[PDB]
Amino acid sequence: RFLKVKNWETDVVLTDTLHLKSTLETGCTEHICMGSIMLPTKDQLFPLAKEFLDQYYSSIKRFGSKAHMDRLEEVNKEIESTSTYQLKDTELIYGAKHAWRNASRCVGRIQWSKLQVFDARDCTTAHGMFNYICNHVKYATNKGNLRSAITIFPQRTDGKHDFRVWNSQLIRYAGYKQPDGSTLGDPANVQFTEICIQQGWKAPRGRFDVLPLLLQANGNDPELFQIPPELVLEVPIRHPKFDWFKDLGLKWYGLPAVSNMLLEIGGLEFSACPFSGWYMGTEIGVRDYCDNSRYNILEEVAKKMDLDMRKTSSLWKDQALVEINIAVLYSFQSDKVTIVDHHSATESFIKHMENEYRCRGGCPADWVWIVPPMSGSITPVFHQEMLNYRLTPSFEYQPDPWNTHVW
């Protein structure tokens, strides 16, 4: 019941007890593992709040204090009256940082305590949201010296007054379906691109068109806003050896800012909570560029490299894939934009694991997502056993708004 995880490359063994604090469920059973599945009232609220305030006051070493019990009493009284409750600023910051800390699929969590939390709970309108989001983007970008940040909009009340950012990320490229049959720009964003147009967006129909913000405040119809171009830091992609690489006409944005997840703290639900950090190189070069359902530039690149593409066993895809990823790193580094390669990030994560087992009793980790999408076994996490379980506070998936919104 006090479980061990072994690293098979180093024989390091860690002992996990943190998992016994786990509340939510994994989706697996004794008879079946679902480890590779993408997505597996007044009454319920108070235990949730108590559990949260319990860990909070423990973290500041005042468990079982006047302050603790008073606050416990205080929230207790408020829940019974108002049917919900509001977090103190200190708890909000703690909650957010720990949602990241607990994100078992995130390889970048060694940075978790340095998160910049922007309290936007006083926001009432989409224009207000746009302002808060522009400020977030500017702060997080920091002219290429990226800084981690989250902006937290008002918590759900009755599910009719939801604050929602309809974009999956604050900054993403448009995707257009061609009469020609294929897809121009980013195929992952074809439906959202359609909705934006369907909402009144004047699409330039280019390859890298930055999408407008679609902001929903207090449950009303969402509104289009254009992020000031000077706030959107982009990197032209070139190769340190291949001159012809520039001519592909590739660029990507510096700021990965995920905006469609739900932040849960002490039972409270923040449905609009865009958060951002900085890219691992493979996120762009392997996934964004080379997934068959994405930019899929693999053939074009290998073509330009004059590789033998007649048989798979020439490993031309693998050769090209590496070069593409060398370029992404090279480009970001050259333009002084924060980026980390998969070797560095995974090494950091192993160190982060070490720390968490040492000062917290463990670290929930989802091997399927932590191992990079290229060169897996030559990174240290491949040989690292991991335990996956769900701790709260947490980030959660939530329905796409257009499948829900009462217009």
Ligand X SMILES: C[C@H](O)[C@H](O)[C@H]1CNc2nc(N)[nH]c(=O)c2N1
Ligand Y SMILES: CN[C@H](C)Cc1cc(C#N)cc(OCc2ccc3c(C)cc(N)nc3c2)c1
Task: State the residues that interact with Zn ion by CB under 5 A.
Answer: 28, 33, 35
- Chain length of the chain: 407
Q: Does 278 bind ligand HEM (CB under 6 A)?
A: yes
Q: Does 100 bind ligand HEM (CB under 6 A)?
A: yes
* From Zn ion, ligand X, ligand Y, none, interface partner of 369 (C-beta below 5 to 8 A by class): ligand X
Sign of CA dihedral 349, 352, 357, 361: negative
Phi/psi of residue 344, nearest 5 degrees: -70, -45
Residues with Cβ < 8 Å from 344, sequence gap 6 or more? Answer: none
Choose among 357, 347, 350, 356: nearest CA to 14.
Answer: 357
Would you say 36 is a known binding-site residue?
yes
d(CA 272, CA 250): 31
Determine how β-strand 164-165 pairs with β-strand 149-152.
Answer: unpaired
Q: Does 168 bind a copy of itself (CB under 8 A)?
A: no
Q: Does 367 bind a copy of itself (CB under 8 A)?
A: yes
Residue numbers at the binding site for ligand Y (CB under 6 A): 256, 258, 260-261, 275-277, 279-280, 283, 287, 397
Residues in contact with ligand HEM, shown as a per-residue x/- string from 244 to 273 under the rule CB under 6 A: ------------------------------
d(CA 307, CA 316): 6
Q: Exactly one of 290, 297, 302, 350 binds a copy of itself (CB under 8 A); which one?
A: 290
Phi/psi of residue 76, nearest 5 degrees: -50, -50
Q: Does 13 bind a copy of itself (CB under 8 A)?
A: no
* From Zn ion, ligand Y, ligand X, none, interface partner of 54 (C-beta below 5 to 8 A by class): none
Residues with Cβ < 8 Å from 220, sequence gap 6 or more? Answer: 126
Q: And the tokens for 226?
A: 């254009």
The DSSP secondary-structure symbol of 228 reads: P
Identify the active-site residue in 100, 106, 166, 238.
106
Q: Choose the stretch contacting ligand X; rule: CB under 6 A; options: 24-32, 137-145, 302-310, 377-385.
A: 377-385
Q: Facing residues of 262 across strands?
A: 396
Determine how β-strand 175-177 pairs with β-strand 183-185.
Answer: antiparallel
Choose among 369, 170, 366: nearest CA to 273.
Answer: 170
Catalytic residue list contains 278: yes
d(CA 282, CA 287): 7
CB of 239 to a copy of itself, least distance (A): 12
The DSSP secondary-structure symbol of 106 reads: -
Residue 223 or 283 having the CB closest to ligand X: 283
Q: Does 384 bind ligand X (CB under 6 A)?
A: yes
d(CA 339, CA 254): 8
Would you say 169 is a known binding-site residue?
yes
Would you say 253 is a known binding-site residue?
no
Identify the active-site residue in 91, 223, 264, 283.
283
Beta strand extents in 217-317 (DSSP E only): 223-225, 234-236, 251-253, 257-258, 262-265, 268-270, 275-276
**Segment 17-76, which members bind a copy of itself (CB under 8 A)?**
19, 22, 25-38
Residue 254 or 267 having the CB closest to ligand Y: 254
Catalytic residue list contains 8: no
Catalytic residue list contains 205: no
- Known binding-site residues for heme b equal 106, 397
Question: What residues line the site for a copy of itself (CB under 8 A)?
Answer: 3, 5-6, 8-9, 19, 22, 25-38, 281, 286-287, 290-293, 298, 312-315, 317-319, 321-322, 325-326, 329, 333, 341, 343-344, 366-368, 371-378, 382-389
Catalytic residues: 106, 109, 278, 283
Binding site for ligand HEM (CB under 6 A): 100, 103, 105-108, 111, 115, 148, 150, 275, 277-278, 280, 283, 340, 345, 369, 395
